[PDB]
Design a protein around this ligand. Structure first.
Ligand SMILES: *N1=[C]C2=C([C]=[C]C(O[C]C3=NN([C])C([C])=C3C3=[C][C]=[C]C4=C3[N]C(C([O])=O)=C4[C][C][C]OC3=[C][C]=[C]C4=C3[C]=[C][C]=[C]4)=[C]2)[C]=[C]1
Length: 150
């Protein structure tokens, strides 16, 4: 078991799917209150990030050339490269996930909605593998919710 991984995947995959489809998942969370609050936080902060960084996000998306599942498997390289360099903070974590939603929207437009699942899995894996101890020290998703509160 790996609760931090499980909860992160739940939050990130739900946010990406909802951003792509425009529809909210009514299914209960795997455990719960924290995840609901995290997802609410992402809707608010993430939508702003996508608006503020439209041009940068378009540029990154073009540089990747996601067309199929094989492209999604390789974008991990770029993601790790850009995300692991420099300092760690919640703003960069929101940027990581927000760009994920941006790509997920693109995937839906090119009829590759199934690729959203490995995309979410890849984002979660990079986040939790590279930032494990920082996330734990920052109190995980409870810390995230607190950081961006009101
Ligand atoms: N091609 C393009 C780029 C390369 C390195 C850096 C770069 O910066 C573009 C940029 N500029 N601003 C102001 C922002 C914000 C960004 C940007 C765009 C997309 C993603 C991110 C950023 N900045 C950050 C950050 O500060 O950590 C990120 C998140 C980490 C990288 O996330 C990535 C990267 C690649 C694919 C995916 C991804 C996240 C989710 C899904 C896919 C432009 C080098 C070459």
């Amino acid at each position: 078991s790996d609760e931090l991984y499980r909860q992160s995947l739940e939050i990130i995959s739900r946010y990406l799917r909802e951003q792509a489809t425009g529809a909210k998942d009514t299914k209960p969370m795997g455990r719960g209150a924290t995840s609901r609050k995290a997802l609410e936080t992402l809707r608010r902060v993430g939508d702003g990030v996508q608006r503020n960084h439209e041009t940068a996000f378009q540029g990154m998306l073009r540089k990747l050339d996601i067309k199929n599942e094989d492209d999604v498997k390789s974008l991990s390289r770029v993601m790790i490269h850009v995300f692991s360099d420099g300092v760690t903070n919640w703003g960069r974590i929101v940027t990581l996930i927000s760009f994920g939603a941006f790509v997920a929207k693109h995937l839906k437009t090119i009829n590759q909605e199934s690729c959203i699942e490995p995309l979410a899995e890849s984002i979660t894996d990079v986040l939790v593998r590279t930032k494990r101890d920082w996330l734990v020290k920052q109190r995980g998703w409870d810390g995230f919710v607190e950081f961006f509160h009101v």
